[PDB]
Amino acid sequence: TLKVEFSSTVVEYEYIVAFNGYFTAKARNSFISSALKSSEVDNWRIIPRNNPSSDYPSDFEVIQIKEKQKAGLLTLEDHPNIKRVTPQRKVFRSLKRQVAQTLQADVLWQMGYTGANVRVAVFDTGLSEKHPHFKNVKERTNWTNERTLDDGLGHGTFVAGVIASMRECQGFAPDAELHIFRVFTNNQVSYTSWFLDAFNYAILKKIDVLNLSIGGPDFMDHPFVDKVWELTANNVIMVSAIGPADQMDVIGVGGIDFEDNIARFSGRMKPDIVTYGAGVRGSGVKGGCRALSGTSVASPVVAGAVTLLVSTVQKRELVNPASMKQALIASARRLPGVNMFEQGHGKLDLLRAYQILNSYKPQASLSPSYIDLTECPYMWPYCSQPIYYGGMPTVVNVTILNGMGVTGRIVDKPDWQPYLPQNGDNIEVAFSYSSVLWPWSGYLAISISVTKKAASWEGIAQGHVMITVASPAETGAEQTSTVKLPIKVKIIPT
Ligand SMILES: *[C@@H]1O[C@H](CO)[C@@H](O)[C@H](O)[C@H]1NC(C)=O
């Protein structure tokens, strides 16, 4: 029903000038003008910005250069304060049941959890001023060149309705504090500078949950991805569709239907989880209800679910991107017969997600939480064949989720411990892994190879890895959480 493609381009002569910090407008201008005094390039100008972030010191600047760009950007990059210069990009988002009760958000509503005092933000095409399905819109800041805060196609209205609503289409969280970020034009066009200014204002606003519908391989570039990491690092639980989502720090979301099938519009394992994204209903542009089926649809489903889950939690101190991701995956109900690269840890379960989140203790975790190369079809393609000595190492890139801190570290070299009675000693596994873990997460890549004594052997070798993640005290002593990763493999003669 609804298809979300993308395309991007670079706009000639315009550059994002990322700074080594957060500067006032004149400081940015003076750094750039000195760096262009050392240089021989004269034909340059700052292309200034009019929006709610213009009233704030910034960590970037948009400039034009037409005469000689290589010398200009090389000289600017060589400026001390100027971290990086990257071209401006132009993206084009091609848009082509009581679900909260079908997930039993009634039971949470019944307890008195509705989304109160949770700032969720929609990075979409806006929300009309006089929509009756909402009660707590706080602001409708704009970031486009179009002079409208309202929604001209609805997608933003549909997303906001699913997250929050009180009418013929019920939203997951009625009492959420809504923040509308019109980052797309009524033609679905945006710019990296628009997104960067909007992300900066989202950081200033301190928005707990962000539903993000921006993708494309080129557009998620160095300033973009860095700003995403900085939001997640500022405790911005981000939710996006896989179609940022496929990054380490964002809750990626896939889409099933109401019969728990994988829909026809549906490395490390992503999505994290799935939920309903076919036949879902949400608010109309001025009013009414409408149903949409597509990949983008489950993302607001999970975003609403997360907003409600955040309201569920007594002490908000414990809610971060990693702990929320951990709950979505631990509570997840596995779909029988779906591999890990379509469903992640299992379709969303709002009530058991609420249960884990209610009992959750700060700790590190792995995704996948175990290795079993003989578990077809979940662990596919690793079960397409067993590991035979003389073959390339089996490499599994494991996400670490450090719910103990935005910064943490592997304390030492992760230890592979084979079971002797189960002849785990017939494999060796090496670790090539990111050392420091930021933000809220890291990675651990494991390269499994059979040993020499079992070149002519057939059977199941087993063992575990004993990793340890440390991160400073967030409450002192480091916060340490050792995590066993069971490993099970079937070996054969070469
Ligand atoms: C694991 O994933 C990360 C992505 O964050 C990547 O940079 C790294 O190279 C991967 N490791 C291996 C061994 O592929």
Numbering used by the authors: 42 to 137, 191 to 337, 349 to 371, 385 to 593, 598 to 616
From the paper:
Site-one protease (S1P, also known as Membrane-bound transcription factor site-1 protease (MBTPS1), or Subtilisin kexin isozyme 1 (SKI-1)), is a membrane-bound protease that mediates the proteolytic activation of transcription factors, hormones, and enzymes required for lipogenesis, the endoplasmic reticulum (ER) stress response, and lysosomal biogenesis, among others. A zymogen serine protease, S1P matures through autoproteolysis of two pro-domains, with one cleavage event in the endoplasmic reticulum (ER) and the other in the Golgi. We recently identified the SREBP regulating gene, (SPRING), which enhances S1P maturation and is necessary for SREBP signaling. SPRING activates S1P by dislodging its inhibitory pro-domain and stabilizing intra-domain contacts.
We therefore obtained a cryo-EM structure of the S1Pecto purified without co-expressed SPRINGecto. The map had a resolution of 2.27 Å using GSFSC cutoff of 0.143 and shows the A-domain bound atop the Peptidase S8 subdomain in a similar position as SPRINGecto. The N- and C-termini of the A-domain run along the side of the Peptidase S8 subdomain. This structure is from a WT S1Pecto sample that has undergone autocatalysis and therefore the density sharply disappears after K137, which corresponds to cleavage at the S1P B-site motif. Our structure of S1Pecto shows that the B-site motif at the C-terminal end of the A-domain is occupying the active site. The P6 Val also makes hydrophobic contacts and the P4 Arg is inserted deeply into an acidic pocket where it makes a salt bridge with D218 of the catalytic triad as well as Q282 and S307. Unlike SPRINGecto, the A-domain of S1Pecto appears to interact only with the Peptidase S8 subdomain. Two loops of the Peptidase S8 subdomain (residues 338-348 and residues 372-384) pack against the GIFT subdomain and were not resolved in the map of S1Pecto without SPRINGecto. Without SPRINGecto, S1Pecto undergoes autocatalysis but remains non-covalently associated with its inhibitory A-domain. Consequently, this S1Pecto is essentially inactive in protease assays based on the S1P cleavage motif from SREBP2.
